[PDB]
Design a protein around this nucleic acid. Structure first.
Ligand SMILES: [Ca+2]
Ligand SMILES: [Ca+2]
Ligand SMILES: [Cl-]
Length: 294
DNA sequence: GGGTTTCCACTTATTCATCATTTTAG
DNA sequence: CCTAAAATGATGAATAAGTGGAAACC
């Protein structure tokens, strides 16, 4: 089941990461060795996702990242041409696009073997200064005259539902909310669909309302950090707008199981079973084995 | 063969995913 | 009164991003 290209790009927009290493080295002529590529680090439970991407691209290496995480790292230079070809045809739409554009400029440098010359390294430092978290303190000290062009902010729209499926497979969450009460059955079942993302992509998060015709944005905070949360709680919207989208565009990873259990609860709610004692017991049993409970 | 590339074990701060009670809407 | 929907209030950790060391390679 080779992963769909757009589903792969949506997943890369969520958990992808481009890397450009500029390491001190005595065994190098210009006194610096480099390493370029793209990586994905997931929990061990979704190692199959990495194995599928590796098999779909016929590129990349897989290794453990601790006792609870796996990573797909592709740094073989000629193998980076598969990455560029994919993202040229199926482009990223988050701020990570700016990181991919720098990753390409770095590829063009190393393809010419300029990274072996001094000016090539000065150019790669130029590019790395705007990539991800920027230059290290050691590099800043080694390149005090470094001057990089301004990095313009990204703003792209959701291309199709395949991308949304891939992005939701990484950032999404399907939740069965058991609103306790001193009522008849004592519990009100409420399905919830959440997508979380940093505020730096507020435009993309805000567009979800019009793209899916439902939901609302909630601003969250934690320490000095903050992020947005696209949420859907109206059952009719969940049953008619959210569920049909991810059934026609299949999710990947373990979250597909949580989505399938999520849909079974929707079927019982649609049939008014959530208002009966036995039906409520089934909703609970389903919730026990979802998400962290699986 | 020696500079360079590639792999592999390993680390870390926070943006994620996931959590649930309380309140309001209809 | 009864049920649905939203608002409120919360945090552990799977992420994104990075690093050390050296075998593989051309
Ligand atoms: Ca992300
Ligand atoms: Ca994820
Ligand atoms: Cl549309």
């Amino acid at each position: 089941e080779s992963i769909n290209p757009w589903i792969l790009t949506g997943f890369a927009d969520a958990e992808g990461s481009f890397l450009l290493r500029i390491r001190n080295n005595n065994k190098s002529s210009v006194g610096y060795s480099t390493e370029l590529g793209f990586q994905i680090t997931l929990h061990n439970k979704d190692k199959s996702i990495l194995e599928n991407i590796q098999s779909t691209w016929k590129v990349g290496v897989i290794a453990n990242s601790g006792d609870n995480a796996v990573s797909l790292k592709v740094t073989r230079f000629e193998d980076l041409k598969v990455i560029i070809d994919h993202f040229e045809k199926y482009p990223l739409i988050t701020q990570k696009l700016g990181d991919y554009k720098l990753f390409k400029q770095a590829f063009s440098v190393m393809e010419n073997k300029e990274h072996l010359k001094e000016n090539g390294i000065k150019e790669l430092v130029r590019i790395k200064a705007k990539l991800n978290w920027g230059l290290t303190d050691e590099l800043k000290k080694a390149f005090p005259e470094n001057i990089s062009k301004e990095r313009s902010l990204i703003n792209k729209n959701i291309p199709n539902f395949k991308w949304l499926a891939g992005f939701t497979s990484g950032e999404g969450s399907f939740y069965v909310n058991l609103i306790k009460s001193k009522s008849k059955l004592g519990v009100q079942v409420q399905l919830r669909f959440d997508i979380t993302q940093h505020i730096k992509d507020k435009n993309l998060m805000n567009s979800l309302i019009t793209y899916l015709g439902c939901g609302y944005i909630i601003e969250y905070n934690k320490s000095e950090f903050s992020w947005l949360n696209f949420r859907v709680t109206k059952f009719s919207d969940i049953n008619d707008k959210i569920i049909p989208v991810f059934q026609e565009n299949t999710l990947i990873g373990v979250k597909l199981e949580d989505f399938e259990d999520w849909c079974k609860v929707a079927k019982l709610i649609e049939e008014k079973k959530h208002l009966t004692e036995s039906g409520l017991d089934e909703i609970k049993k389903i919730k026990l084995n979802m998400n962290k409970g699986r």
